[PDB]
Amino acid sequence: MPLILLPAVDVVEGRAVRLVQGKAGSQTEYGSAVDAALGWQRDGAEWIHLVDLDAAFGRGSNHELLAEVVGKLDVQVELSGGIRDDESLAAALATGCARVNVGTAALENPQWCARVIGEHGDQVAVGLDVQIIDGEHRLRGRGWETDGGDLWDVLERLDSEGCSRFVVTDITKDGTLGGPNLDLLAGVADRTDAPVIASGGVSSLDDLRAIATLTHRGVEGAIVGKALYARRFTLPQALAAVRD
């Protein structure tokens, strides 16, 4: 089965934006979130990775707009950002999205996260936001502002709890067009039976072909942000590339 592509729509104040390594001063803007989402759908997206960046950064919410976007889309939505308790989880799922991602909550409230995993199964994936410094793989929460512990210990815990799916980002590569971290992706995929979704750094069609070589090891999909918005390549080119 080919690598699934998930065009990203990261939302700040109703707008589709990109950042370089999550920094405030690096923001590029690409029109309304709804137009971005419908545009990728028109180009053939099977999935949209829809993120509330304001919620992720704890500075506000785009929930009502995101609910409208999910409602308007025919294709499947992976919704993320600020899902950290029973209210926010239920509100996300009530949009009718295909699944959600929790990130910070896996680091800060492992007990809640385990119970959510146990009751929601395939509708909840966990985002692992990784920073590697001197070979030390650390997780980051709260818009990458906090340390969330050792990647490998947390990965094993979530795997033992029956976590359905992992979304793995190298925060150093995110929004850089510097290429994906194939070693990190393989490392995670080899240490869980759960499918892995690659996120961050894709810069070319060759980058997608490289990720596609990991599909047999557990890398089921790839989230693509900047490369699409910055027009490095088109979605149909990308869809064709993961098959060639």
Ligand SMILES: NC(=O)c1ncn([C@@H]2O[C@H](COP(=O)(O)O)[C@@H](O)[C@H]2O)c1NCNCC(O)[C@H](O)[C@H](O)COP(=O)(O)O
């Ligand atoms: N500093 C940040 O950018 C950031 N801070 C938090 N998030 C996201 O918030 C969501 C969970 O929020 P919670 O911590 O659970 O409240 C997770 O999906 C987490 O990745 C962040 N990123 C969310 N956006 C993910 C992408 O970066 C995008 O989906 C593409 O993969 C871009 O990569 P590319 O432009 O290099 O292609």
